[PDB]
Structure formats: structure tokens, C-alpha cells
Amino acid sequence: SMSETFDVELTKNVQGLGITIAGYIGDPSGIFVKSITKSSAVEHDGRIQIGDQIIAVDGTNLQGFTNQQAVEVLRHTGQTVLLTLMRRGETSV
């Protein structure tokens, strides 16, 4: 197994952060970056990539949460956000 964990301090503009994030919902888990908007704060920063897992927001660890619970933390953020992400490079399946 191998992963990278990193954090990114971001300040929203008119387009917000500029990421679309998703996880499985219904009856491993997690929420992941699906897309990054052109000219967004996230794109400008350059570190975050599609497939990165969001594992913490503003001091709140998300890894024990339901995916929708985690989504709601992101939805209710203020203008400045500290995101912690995990990027998996090797897995055993």
C-alpha cells in the first residue's frame, strides 16, 4: 500500500472552491474529487487532482462519516477552507 496525504488552504471566489466532489450513497467508502472547474481557486492552486479523497475539512476528520455527512460538511463551509486530502498510489485488492 502507498498513499500521499497533504493539505491545502484555499480561499473561495465567485465560483467557490471550484471542485465537484462525490461518494457512493444508498442502502471502502469516502468522498472524492470528480472534477475541477477552469480558472477556479483549486485549479489556480494546482495541487488537488481528480481522484483525491477529501479526508478532513477545517479540523474535522471525515473518515468515520457517512458520505452524505461528509458532503454536507463541505457544503456548509465558509470562504476560507483547509482541506486535507489522501491520494492512493498502491492498493491491495
GROMACS .gro file of C-alpha atoms in nm, residues 15 18 36-40 43:
model
    8
   15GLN     CA    1  -1.702   3.016  -0.825
   18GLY     CA    2  -1.422   2.503  -0.789
   36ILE     CA    3  -1.209   2.083  -1.113
   37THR     CA    4  -1.353   2.399  -1.268
   38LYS     CA    5  -1.143   2.604  -1.510
   39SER     CA    6  -0.984   2.917  -1.356
   40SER     CA    7  -1.100   2.819  -1.006
   43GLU     CA    8  -0.715   2.492  -1.031
   0.00000   0.00000   0.00000
